[PDB]
Design an enzyme around this catalytic site. Structure first.
Site, PDB file in Angstrom:
ATOM      1  N   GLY A  61       0.818  -1.259   0.220  1.00  0.00           N
ATOM      2  CA  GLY A  61       0.100   0.130  -0.052  1.00  0.00           C
ATOM      3  C   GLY A  61       0.847   1.381  -0.136  1.00  0.00           C
TER       4      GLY A  61
ATOM      5  N   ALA B  88       2.242   3.044   2.384  1.00  0.00           N
ATOM      6  CA  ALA B  88       3.037   2.820   3.441  1.00  0.00           C
ATOM      7  C   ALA B  88       4.135   1.758   2.890  1.00  0.00           C
TER       8      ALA B  88
ATOM      9  N   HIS C  25      -5.722  -0.661  -0.781  1.00  0.00           N
ATOM     10  CA  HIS C  25      -6.950   0.379  -0.593  1.00  0.00           C
ATOM     11  C   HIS C  25      -6.649   1.753  -0.795  1.00  0.00           C
ATOM     12  N   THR C  26      -5.138   2.123  -0.730  1.00  0.00           N
ATOM     13  CA  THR C  26      -4.714   3.545  -0.852  1.00  0.00           C
ATOM     14  C   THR C  26      -5.403   4.164  -2.141  1.00  0.00           C
TER      15      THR C  26
ATOM     16  N   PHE D  38      -9.517  20.437   4.730  1.00  0.00           N
ATOM     17  CA  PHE D  38     -10.157  18.826   5.228  1.00  0.00           C
ATOM     18  C   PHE D  38      -9.861  18.897   6.728  1.00  0.00           C
TER      19      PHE D  38
ATOM     20  N   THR E  75       0.143  -3.611   6.538  1.00  0.00           N
ATOM     21  CA  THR E  75      -1.249  -4.312   6.017  1.00  0.00           C
ATOM     22  C   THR E  75      -2.474  -3.498   6.162  1.00  0.00           C
TER      23      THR E  75
ATOM     24  N   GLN F  46     -12.991   5.341  13.415  1.00  0.00           N
ATOM     25  CA  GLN F  46     -13.841   6.578  12.950  1.00  0.00           C
ATOM     26  C   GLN F  46     -14.927   6.313  11.713  1.00  0.00           C
TER      27      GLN F  46
ATOM     28  N   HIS G 283     -17.421   7.816   8.920  1.00  0.00           N
ATOM     29  CA  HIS G 283     -17.293   8.827   7.735  1.00  0.00           C
ATOM     30  C   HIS G 283     -19.077   9.433   7.725  1.00  0.00           C
TER      31      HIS G 283
ATOM     32  N   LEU H  88     -17.854   5.649  -0.115  1.00  0.00           N
ATOM     33  CA  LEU H  88     -17.588   7.050   0.512  1.00  0.00           C
ATOM     34  C   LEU H  88     -17.802   8.022  -0.449  1.00  0.00           C
TER      35      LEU H  88
ATOM     36  N   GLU I  27     -15.849  14.181   1.663  1.00  0.00           N
ATOM     37  CA  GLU I  27     -16.308  15.486   2.380  1.00  0.00           C
ATOM     38  C   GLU I  27     -16.449  16.535   1.330  1.00  0.00           C
TER      39      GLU I  27
ATOM     40  N   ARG J 291     -16.837  16.341  12.816  1.00  0.00           N
ATOM     41  CA  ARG J 291     -17.153  15.192  12.105  1.00  0.00           C
ATOM     42  C   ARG J 291     -18.338  14.402  12.900  1.00  0.00           C
TER      43      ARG J 291
ATOM     44  N   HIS K  14     -15.375   3.422   8.592  1.00  0.00           N
ATOM     45  CA  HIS K  14     -14.324   4.044   7.830  1.00  0.00           C
ATOM     46  C   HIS K  14     -12.755   3.950   8.201  1.00  0.00           C
TER      47      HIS K  14
ATOM     48  N   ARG L  89      -8.694  10.506  14.243  1.00  0.00           N
ATOM     49  CA  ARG L  89      -7.817  11.059  13.111  1.00  0.00           C
ATOM     50  C   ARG L  89      -8.359  12.039  12.591  1.00  0.00           C
ATOM     51  N   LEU L  90      -7.162  12.965  12.006  1.00  0.00           N
ATOM     52  CA  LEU L  90      -7.755  14.182  11.422  1.00  0.00           C
ATOM     53  C   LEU L  90      -7.710  13.930   9.901  1.00  0.00           C
TER      54      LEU L  90
ATOM     55  N   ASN M 160      -4.737  13.082   7.055  1.00  0.00           N
ATOM     56  CA  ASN M 160      -3.641  13.152   7.892  1.00  0.00           C
ATOM     57  C   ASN M 160      -3.224  11.611   7.741  1.00  0.00           C
TER      58      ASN M 160
HETATM   59  C1  LIG Z   1     -11.219   3.440   2.850  1.00  0.00           C
HETATM   60  C2  LIG Z   1     -10.797   4.756   2.733  1.00  0.00           C
HETATM   61  C3  LIG Z   1      -9.734   5.343   3.263  1.00  0.00           C
HETATM   62  C4  LIG Z   1      -9.083   6.663   3.360  1.00  0.00           C
HETATM   63  C5  LIG Z   1      -9.898   7.317   2.343  1.00  0.00           C
HETATM   64  C6  LIG Z   1     -10.810   6.801   1.626  1.00  0.00           C
HETATM   65  C7  LIG Z   1     -11.564   5.651   1.639  1.00  0.00           C
HETATM   66  C8  LIG Z   1     -12.408   5.266   0.873  1.00  0.00           C
HETATM   67  N1  LIG Z   1      -9.379   8.605   1.992  1.00  0.00           N
HETATM   68  C9  LIG Z   1      -8.292   9.309   2.680  1.00  0.00           C
HETATM   69  C10 LIG Z   1      -8.049  10.746   2.382  1.00  0.00           C
HETATM   70  O1  LIG Z   1      -8.670  11.266   1.351  1.00  0.00           O
HETATM   71  N2  LIG Z   1      -6.960  11.280   3.157  1.00  0.00           N
HETATM   72  C11 LIG Z   1      -6.224  10.492   3.899  1.00  0.00           C
HETATM   73  O2  LIG Z   1      -5.533  11.229   4.578  1.00  0.00           O
HETATM   74  N3  LIG Z   1      -6.566   9.126   4.277  1.00  0.00           N
HETATM   75  C12 LIG Z   1      -7.662   8.619   3.530  1.00  0.00           C
HETATM   76  N4  LIG Z   1      -8.108   7.365   4.131  1.00  0.00           N
HETATM   77  C13 LIG Z   1      -7.248   6.327   4.858  1.00  0.00           C
HETATM   78  C14 LIG Z   1      -5.889   6.016   4.195  1.00  0.00           C
HETATM   79  O3  LIG Z   1      -5.947   5.988   2.977  1.00  0.00           O
HETATM   80  C15 LIG Z   1      -5.776   4.419   4.639  1.00  0.00           C
HETATM   81  O4  LIG Z   1      -5.861   4.269   6.046  1.00  0.00           O
HETATM   82  C16 LIG Z   1      -4.423   4.071   3.921  1.00  0.00           C
HETATM   83  O5  LIG Z   1      -4.256   3.930   2.697  1.00  0.00           O
HETATM   84  C17 LIG Z   1      -4.026   2.650   4.421  1.00  0.00           C
HETATM   85  O6  LIG Z   1      -2.913   2.259   3.529  1.00  0.00           O
HETATM   86  P1  LIG Z   1      -1.855   1.132   4.053  1.00  0.00           P
HETATM   87  O7  LIG Z   1      -0.324   1.557   3.567  1.00  0.00           O
HETATM   88  O8  LIG Z   1      -1.881   1.123   5.470  1.00  0.00           O
HETATM   89  O9  LIG Z   1      -2.333  -0.056   3.244  1.00  0.00           O
HETATM   90  P2  LIG Z   1      -3.302  -0.332   2.305  1.00  0.00           P
HETATM   91  O10 LIG Z   1      -3.516   0.687   1.480  1.00  0.00           O
HETATM   92  O11 LIG Z   1      -4.581  -0.706   3.245  1.00  0.00           O
HETATM   93  O12 LIG Z   1      -2.889  -1.839   1.809  1.00  0.00           O
HETATM   94  C18 LIG Z   1      -2.653  -2.950   2.639  1.00  0.00           C
HETATM   95  C19 LIG Z   1      -1.402  -3.897   1.825  1.00  0.00           C
HETATM   96  O13 LIG Z   1      -1.107  -4.997   2.788  1.00  0.00           O
HETATM   97  C20 LIG Z   1      -1.562  -6.176   1.866  1.00  0.00           C
HETATM   98  N5  LIG Z   1      -1.933  -7.244   2.721  1.00  0.00           N
HETATM   99  C21 LIG Z   1      -2.921  -7.450   3.678  1.00  0.00           C
HETATM  100  N6  LIG Z   1      -3.049  -8.485   4.112  1.00  0.00           N
HETATM  101  C22 LIG Z   1      -1.872  -9.200   3.689  1.00  0.00           C
HETATM  102  C23 LIG Z   1      -1.506 -10.796   3.836  1.00  0.00           C
HETATM  103  N7  LIG Z   1      -2.365 -11.407   4.836  1.00  0.00           N
HETATM  104  N8  LIG Z   1      -0.407 -11.108   3.047  1.00  0.00           N
HETATM  105  C24 LIG Z   1       0.167 -10.355   2.303  1.00  0.00           C
HETATM  106  N9  LIG Z   1      -0.044  -9.038   2.059  1.00  0.00           N
HETATM  107  C25 LIG Z   1      -1.181  -8.498   2.883  1.00  0.00           C
HETATM  108  C26 LIG Z   1      -2.273  -5.802   0.932  1.00  0.00           C
HETATM  109  O14 LIG Z   1      -2.295  -6.568  -0.366  1.00  0.00           O
HETATM  110  C27 LIG Z   1      -1.832  -4.265   0.551  1.00  0.00           C
HETATM  111  O15 LIG Z   1      -0.879  -4.314  -0.451  1.00  0.00           O
HETATM  112  O1  LIG Z   2     -12.916  11.020   3.368  1.00  0.00           O
HETATM  113  C1  LIG Z   2     -12.720  11.951   2.941  1.00  0.00           C
HETATM  114  O2  LIG Z   2     -12.736  12.655   1.718  1.00  0.00           O
HETATM  115  C2  LIG Z   2     -11.615  12.919   4.115  1.00  0.00           C
HETATM  116  C3  LIG Z   2     -11.357  11.972   5.370  1.00  0.00           C
HETATM  117  O3  LIG Z   2     -12.063  12.083   6.442  1.00  0.00           O
HETATM  118  C4  LIG Z   2     -10.246  10.988   5.346  1.00  0.00           C
HETATM  119  O4  LIG Z   2      -8.835  11.403   5.150  1.00  0.00           O
HETATM  120  O5  LIG Z   2     -10.592   9.685   4.970  1.00  0.00           O
END
Ligand SMILES: *Cc1cc2c(cc1C)nc1c(=O)[nH]c(=O)nc-1n2C[C@H](O)[C@H](O)[C@H](O)COP(=O)(O)OP(=O)(O)OC[C@H]1O[C@@H](n2cnc3c(N)ncnc32)[C@H](O)[C@@H]1O
Ligand SMILES: O=C([O-])CC(=O)C(=O)O
Ligand SMILES: CCCCCCCCCCCCOCCOCCOCCOCCOCCOCCOCCOCCO
Ligand SMILES: C[C@H](c1ccc(Cl)cc1)c1cc([N+](=O)[O-])cc([N+](=O)[O-])c1O
Ligand code: SF4
Ligand code: F3S
Ligand code: FES
Lengths: 243, 130, 577, 119
Positions: free
Chosen positions: C14, C16, C45-46, C117, C193, C231, C233, C243, C246, C288, C356, C391-392, C395
């Site tokens: 992802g 990170a 999911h990013t 935001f 993860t 958190q 939404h 989603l 906002e 929120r 969310h 969470r903000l 952020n």
């Molecule tokens: C759901 C969501 C979150 C979100 C958002 C909109 C939605 C619809 N909008 C945001 C925004 O506008 N601004 C912001 O600050 N944050 C926003 N968020 C939250 C944020 O995006 C998420 O918290 C963040 O993207 C999380 O990323 P992360 O790097 O932590 O990881 P990931 O994208 O969720 O992906 C996970 C990776 O790990 C691998 N995986 C998982 N399980 C396994 C196993 N068992 N074995 C091997 N690999 C694994 C996945 O495949 C993936 O690559």
């Molecule tokens: O959902 C949005 O557009 C903004 C928010 O609260 C998040 O950073 O996930």
């Protein structure tokens, strides 16, 4: 109330039992909101747990959904039963080797995508100096082409790819074009080789179906044609460069 | 060893016969035929033109066939289909920005057709009014 | 089991994971990094983020403002030293992504533009239209293709990590297509993860955000911190839970009940603002939690609109106008049209609060390292102590690249001075992972994993929602316990080997149940109301900085029991008054 | 996997011709088929506009020579290029396809050249 039912034909295939794929039929409940992906979930849950397929976002932005619906490459999660009341047949994304059920080998895609060096090349600017300056006018040059979710429907749409599996593909080329056209990148020459190949832009006969199916309206076809033009410019320059 | 048996569907010579979009593609490329046939015809005429009025009258007689007249009507049809589709695709080769937006194809498509119109008129004039 | 040698193994591609992998290849050009992920990197999911990523940019801003915004929004449960490092390294990472190509939207002078935001007074959220996550995840992923040090293991499902004598020594994963187990050896593993939103019936998450990473750290004595803070939404589509950014509101969208009344004015977010000029802090742009709670209150009064997909309130955007809509809300529009059949230019969009973001996560120090030496966690699966009890907005994405880089560098050092371990032990661990997997495979009992999944979600929704009561939270804990017993009676009828999802989904399910219990117990014990955690019972409805200004640490013992411990919050320049 | 240094293609030469060719036949081909294949053999023209003497008078003029050349040749380069690829699309094996189609083109081109430097 009482939901309607739709007899969905899914082309199953188990490489440990089956010699070749074969249809299966499932009765699935549905309404004006039911999507293919929704359907596939229902089947796996109550009808046939061994049904395997790729998905995640559920909102046509991740790009794993790709499959064929009545011979049209579509994203399961952006496909709705309400539109297939007179029959629906689901098969694995065309022009790819069927690994199992609705899962195909996306390796070529990935390698292709890798081969064009899809990354900013040759810009020495460092974080501390701030970000590059790019105007809206400049971004407009590649913006559209950056929206590719790598779903691969274009590859299931392109007949030239089905005829020439070595063709790097629509997406790949668009990605490449995307970076070539970014006023911040300076690695066009690092990409030309691949685009100049016979398996590059020149393997495309502008059938144009790829742009027709792109769920993200990237219009790869337009990128390739534009590529052809750059490739041709490259060929001339190379002919006059006896240096 | 692997328990994976990757099934590779085959691709027949009749793939385009399936989906209309492919059929129309074929048609579009099919225009190549009547196009060369017309070039050939132009050569017949060109050399009959040189072999004197006697020969030229023989060429004109050929064009009056009227089976050749049908073929040539088909040729004009094919020709237009080519112009129609050509114009639609040509603009996809240019990447022009008009104030922060990637424009096209409509503007270009319109110009080409405009140019064809004027050309069709100027040639008909020249070839007939004088 | 075949084996692979790597300096560091990163679980998760992802935002990170990728940032970490790149920071590690730039730190040690000769490193052999094993970046693993159960889906091709770009499907993480990013890719779904639409709002943006925060980073002080404007001249009238200050890292202090961003600092204060973060601490206040977190209701003082933030590790103030962490937050400081965070705000100070954001500008750098956003700019760096700009250098790697990320097309952030621009000001006419070519400078990057920012918008507001998370209620921040000074706008500082960088954005890529309303496809920001897509543009970061892809920029990262593609940027990472130039580093030969990074050897990807696409579509590999990490089953467990290998620990011996307090130090991590690699991990076991399953080649998804092949159906074969693999052993990757490394003296530093980074967990990236993501969260666990998927334990809720209705959420905004992708089907893969199951909390596997968290579940694994739980199995090794590592604790999950502040898991009670989930958190929600305020604006998600009924059923799908998808989603509606906002942004719809920052562009003048309004929320109305069945009477067409903009009810938010009766909940302290008044006076009503003109259709034209929406104001931060007010009406549809209020706090929120208050906006989400307003829904609940409206629901009690019977002011919500009943639909086949459930009760909702209306997100009215018509008065926005074509140009604006399509220039700043093209995605939101297409989603709306496709999943609820609604044109945000012609009709109002049916919405309601949705599960969310996961604030809690694997406990880590200021360098993302866990209690197990060598084991790190970064991203939504962790808990650097940046978000506190809330969470903000914007952020999280910032966090991915700020702490992903950190995690990468630190892990690099940690593997270079790691020294060696007991081979027979490490190997005995792998045998264990394998044996356990066989145990699950041979398990019989006729219980359908999916019905357990459904029940779990229903429970988290009813017991751990927007408003919590000890009676219902307890009801949920009792359900999760039950569902654990049932889990052991599950039979995985698919015994195939090529891309067997039946097995994988079942494993994922296991992790959720474990993680769900941490959340429920964590919440039931927090006899206070803080940030995302709000209780209705007497003596709990308010914030208690005397008895609960501490982190919740949830551990899972070998007997299947979830025990809690509490730790103190590092204050630096902003005391909780 | 995918060859790391593929051989450059020579297609930009035929594509370049076919390009100019397609464009010429797009703009001028319809009107010409009208005149020659319909108006002429149906006498649908004023007086002696398309009479042997007049056509010859034109064909023998410099501009007429250049125009007749391009009007015959450009379309060829476009059309044959297409038939070439059509062979592939149709999965028809054609030995030395390239030489066949582009050769035919060159031959006819020459033939045409001779014709306009005049018989
Ligand atoms: C759901 C969501 C979150 C979100 C958002 C909109 C939605 C619809 N909008 C945001 C925004 O506008 N601004 C912001 O600050 N944050 C926003 N968020 C939250 C944020 O995006 C998420 O918290 C963040 O993207 C999380 O990323 P992360 O790097 O932590 O990881 P990931 O994208 O969720 O992906 C996970 C990776 O790990 C691998 N995986 C998982 N399980 C396994 C196993 N068992 N074995 C091997 N690999 C694994 C996945 O495949 C993936 O690559
Ligand atoms: O959902 C949005 O557009 C903004 C928010 O609260 C998040 O950073 O996930
Ligand atoms: C008078 C008839 C002359 C025929 C002209 C045909 C020209 C068509 C050229 C097409 C060439 C195709 O290349 C085919 C080989 O397959 C390899 C593809 O990758 C590209 C390799 O480089 C191409 C090599 O062909 C070069 C053509 O050189 C021109 C021919 O000169 C002929 C002169 O004849 C006069 C002598 O009596
Ligand atoms: C886009 C490209 C083109 C060529 C010539 C000109 Cl003059 C302008 C554009 C082009 C157009 C078409 N078209 O049908 O319009 C076809 C192909 N092609 O390779 O088949 C092709 O490469
Ligand atoms: S161009 Fe369109 S079809 Fe092709 S992969 Fe990209 S998003 Fe999918
Ligand atoms: S369909 Fe294939 S032929 Fe070109 S226009 Fe698209 S890549
Ligand atoms: S689940 Fe993301 S494209 Fe369908």
């Amino acid at each position: 109330a009482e939901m309607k039912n739709l007899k969905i034909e899914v082309v199953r295939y188990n490489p440990e039992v089956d010699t070749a794929p074969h249809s299966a039929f499932y009765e699935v409940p549905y309404d004006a909101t039911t999507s293919l992906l929704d359907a596939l979930g229902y089947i796996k849950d109550n009808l046939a747990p061994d049904l395997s397929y790729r998905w995640s976002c559920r909102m046509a932005i991740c790009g794993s959904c790709g499959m064929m619906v009545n011979n049209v490459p579509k994203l399961a999660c952006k496909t709705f039963l309400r539109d297939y009341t007179d029959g629906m047949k689901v098969e694995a994304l065309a022009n790819f080797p069927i690994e199992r059920d609705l899962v195909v080998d996306m390796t070529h895609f990935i390698e292709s995508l890798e081969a064009i060096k899809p990354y900013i090349i040759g810009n020495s600017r460092t974080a501390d100096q701030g970000t590059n300056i790019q105007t809206p006018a400049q971004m407009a040059k590649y913006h559209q082409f950056s929206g590719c979710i790598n779903c691969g429907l274009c590859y299931a749409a392109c007949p030239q790819f089905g005829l020439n599996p070595e063709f790097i593909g629509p997406a790949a080329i668009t990605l490449a074009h995307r970076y070539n056209e970014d006023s911040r990148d300076h690695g066009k020459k690092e990409r030309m080789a691949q685009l100049n190949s016979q398996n590059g832009v020149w393997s495309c006969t502008f059938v144009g179906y790829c742009s027709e199916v792109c769920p993200k309206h990237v219009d790869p076809a337009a990128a390739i044609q534009q590529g052809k033009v750059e490739s041709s410019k490259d060929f001339l320059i190379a002919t006059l460069k006896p240096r | 060893t692997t328990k994976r048996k990757p099934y590779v569907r085959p691709m027949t010579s009749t793939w385009w016969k399936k989906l209309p979009f492919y059929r129309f593609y074929m048609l579009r490329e099919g225009t190549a035929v009547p196009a060369v046939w017309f070039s050939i015809e132009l050569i017949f005429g060109l050399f009959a033109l040189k072999n004197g009025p006697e020969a030229w009258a023989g060429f004109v007689d050929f064009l009056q066939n009227p089976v050749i007249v049908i073929i040539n009507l088909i040729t004009l049809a094919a020709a237009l289909l080519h112009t129609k589709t050509w114009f639609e695709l040509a603009p996809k080769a240019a990447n022009i920005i008009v104030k922060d937006e990637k424009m096209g194809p409509e503007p270009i498509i319109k110009s080409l057709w405009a140019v064809t119109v004027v050309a069709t008129i100027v040639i008909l004039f020249v070839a007939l009014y004088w | 089991m075949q084996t692979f040698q790597a300096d560091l193994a990163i679980v998760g591609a992802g935002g990170a994971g990728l940032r970490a992998a790149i920071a590690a290849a730039q730190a040690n050009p000769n490193a052999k990094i094993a970046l693993i992920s159960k889906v091709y990197p770009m499907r993480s999911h990013t890719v779904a983020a639409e709002g943006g990523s925060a980073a002080v940019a404007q001249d009238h801003d200050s890292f202090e403002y961003h600092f204060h915004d973060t601490v206040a929004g977190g209701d003082w449960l933030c590790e103030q030293d962490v937050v400081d490092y965070f705000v100070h390294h954001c500008p750098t990472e956003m700019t760096q992504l700009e250098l790697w190509g990320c097309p952030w939207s621009r000001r006419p002078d070519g400078s990057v533009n920012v918008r507001r935001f998370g209620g921040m007074k000074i706008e500082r959220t960088w954005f890529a239209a309303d496809k920001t996550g897509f543009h970061m995840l892809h920029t990262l992923f593609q940027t990472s293709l130039q580093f030969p040090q990074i050897q990807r293991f696409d579509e590999h499902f990490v089953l467990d990590i290998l620990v011996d004598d307090g130090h991590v020594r690699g991990l076991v994963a399953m080649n998804m297509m092949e159906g074969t187990l693999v052993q990757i050896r490394a003296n530093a593993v980074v967990m990236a993860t993501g969260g666990a939103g998927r334990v809720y019936r209705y959420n905004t998450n992708g089907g893969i955000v199951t909390g596997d990473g968290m579940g694994m750290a739980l199995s090794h004595g590592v604790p999950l911190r502040d898991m009670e803070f989930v958190q929600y939404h305020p604006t998600g589509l009924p059923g799908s839970g998808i989603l509606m950014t906002e942004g719809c509101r920052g562009e003048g969208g309004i929320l109305v009940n069945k009477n067409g009344y903009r009810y938010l004015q009766d909940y302290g977010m008044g006076p009503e603002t003109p259709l034209g000029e929406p104001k931060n802090k007010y009406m549809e742009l209020g706090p929120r939690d208050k906006v989400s709670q307003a829904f609940w209150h409206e629901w009690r009064k019977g002011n919500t609109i009943s639909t086949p997909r459930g009760d909702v309130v209306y997100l009215d955007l018509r008065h926005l106008g074509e140009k604006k809509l399509h220039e700043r809300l093209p995605f939101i529009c297409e989603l709306a049209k496709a999943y609820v059949g609604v044109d945000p230019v012609k009709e109002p969009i049916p919405v309601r609060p949705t599960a969310h973001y996961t604030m809690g996560g694997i406990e880590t120090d200021q360098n993302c390292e866990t209690r197990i030496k060598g084991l790190f966690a970064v991203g939504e699966c962790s808990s650097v102590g940046l978000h506190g009890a809330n969470r903000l907005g914007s952020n999280s994405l910032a966090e991915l690249v700020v702490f992903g880089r950190l995690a990468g560098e630190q892990a690099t050092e940690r593997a270079a001075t790691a020294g060696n371990g007991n081979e027979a032990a490490i190997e005995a661990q792998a045998a264990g992972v394998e044996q356990r997997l066989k145990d699950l495979v041979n398990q019989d009992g006729g219980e359908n994993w999916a019905k357990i999944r459904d029940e779990m979600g229903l429970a988290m929704e009813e017991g751990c929602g927007i408003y919590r009561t000890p009676e219902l939270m307890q009801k949920t804990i009792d359900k999760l316990a039950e569902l654990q017993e049932r889990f052991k009676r599950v039979r995985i009828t698919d015994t195939s080997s090529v891309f067997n999802t039946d097995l994988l989904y079942t494993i994922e399910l296991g992790h959720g149940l474990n993680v769900a219990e941490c959340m429920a117990h964590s919440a039931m014990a927090r006899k206070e109301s803080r940030g995302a955690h709000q209780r209705l019972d007497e003596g709990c409805t308010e914030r208690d900085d005397v008895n609960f200004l501490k982190h919740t640490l949830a551990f899972r013992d070998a007997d299947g029991t979830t025990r809690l411990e509490y730790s103190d919050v590092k204050i630096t320049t902003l005391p909780p008054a | 996997m995918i060859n790391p240094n593929p051989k450059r293609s020579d297609e930009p030469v035929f594509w370049g011709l076919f390009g100019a060719g397609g464009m010429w036949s797009a703009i001028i081909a319809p009107v010409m088929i009208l005149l020659v294949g319909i108006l002429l053999p149906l006498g649908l023209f004023p007086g002696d506009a398309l009479s042997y003497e007049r056509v010859l008078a034109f064909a023998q003029s410099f501009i007429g020579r250049v125009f007749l050349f391009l009007m015959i040749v450009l379309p060829l380069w476009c059309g044959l290029h297409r038939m070439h690829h059509a062979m592939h699309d149709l999965k028809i094996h054609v030995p030395a396809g390239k030489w066949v189609f582009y050769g035919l083109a060159a031959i006819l081109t020459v033939v045409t050249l001779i014709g306009v430097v005049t018989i």
